[PDB]
Amino acid sequence: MKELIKVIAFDADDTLWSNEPFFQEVEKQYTDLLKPYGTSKEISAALFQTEMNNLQILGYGAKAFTISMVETALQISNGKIAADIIRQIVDLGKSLLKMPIELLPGVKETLKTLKETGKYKLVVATKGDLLDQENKLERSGLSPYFDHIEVMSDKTEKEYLRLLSILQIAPSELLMVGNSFKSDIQPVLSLGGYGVHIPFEETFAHERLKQVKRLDDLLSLLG
Amino acid sequence: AMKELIKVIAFDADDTLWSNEPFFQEVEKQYTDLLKPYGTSKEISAALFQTEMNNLQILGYGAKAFTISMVETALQISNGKIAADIIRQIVDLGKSLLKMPIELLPGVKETLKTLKETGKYKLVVATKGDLLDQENKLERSGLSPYFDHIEVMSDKTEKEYLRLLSILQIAPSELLMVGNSFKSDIQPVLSLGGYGVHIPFEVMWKHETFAHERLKQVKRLDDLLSLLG
């Protein structure tokens, strides 16, 4: 921590700001549009199937989500769905790209304090559409605290190794902070790095892992 | 002269390493053919371009953005009249861009293989567009072994080239950028203090730049090899 960690990487969505609630409300509104074709659970299962079938070419993010929404609508309706439902679906997807940014507790004070130490390089480590993530950061007001954003095509060990290489450090010099144990924490621990898990409201404990309730609790862990 | 300064050689990908525009053009032609009832190809293309530009600050560049704009333009220009079957065809067109065959341009494989074999540089791709799509393209191209890093950019202005330099941890003076687009690939790097090799893309047979101290213009990518030897 003292003279091991050089880089503190932060997940963005549900770590720096709320994201999943906005997405889930969009998914709810989508499933309301496809009522004739199934229960909300059923429509969500079909959409997830499409997302998974599209994963290798579309990847992650709001643009991918929008395209899978349109496809699933076309599919489940046997290509008979009204064009106006398609217009609504595209509008829903675009709402995701203009979502207002609501910072989570302690985020602003933590990043300011870390910036003012001048001790760590601070980066955002996120999947998704590059422009979207860039825009979210800008409108969060947090851009002055961050050296830059690393947008990733996935969050497996392979992509974290690419991140480490780009940053010119070894795994033991990286601290990753995020809400997802599976995507933000596990892969980084597996490589040799450190994690702070901040759940957003199945895991295991680990010597290079701490779980905290809110992001500002990070500051005592560094001291 | 330049050959001792350079630490990183960045390449544009589309229409530099492989042919891209022809396939995008053929998808757009098929699009206009689908929307023939609502306007001339010239008219359909103009409405599409206007949508792309109005969506640029939230959708940006690349095949996903294009798909979404093709859909939105079809809906708007048909005043909602268009059938779902046609929207499905449009989505499949956009997705066809993500499975495009990669056809390497002249001298590309030999230039990159030779440069990698010197051990002398970091070789990177510097490209706009969707990150996954550009990684998939590089993988399908067979060229991935020669590149240290793909840098996907949200635009190709001085601001984004400074980001790249900062990420690479080098000075403008230590970057050589190679690309087919003088406006996007070459001028911004020259303006920051970097070097450029302009390699015009000719495959379009379109009906028919300046000289600069740190610019070379070449016809074929492997021409690069003797600028650096």
Ligand SMILES: [Cl-]
């Ligand atoms: Cl993420």
Ligand SMILES: [Cl-]
């Ligand atoms: Cl580009």
Ligand SMILES: [Mg+2]
């Ligand atoms: Mg997250």
Ligand SMILES: [Mg+2]
């Ligand atoms: Mg991959």
Ligand SMILES: [Mg+2]
């Ligand atoms: Mg190009």
Ligand SMILES: [Mg+2]
């Ligand atoms: Mg795109």
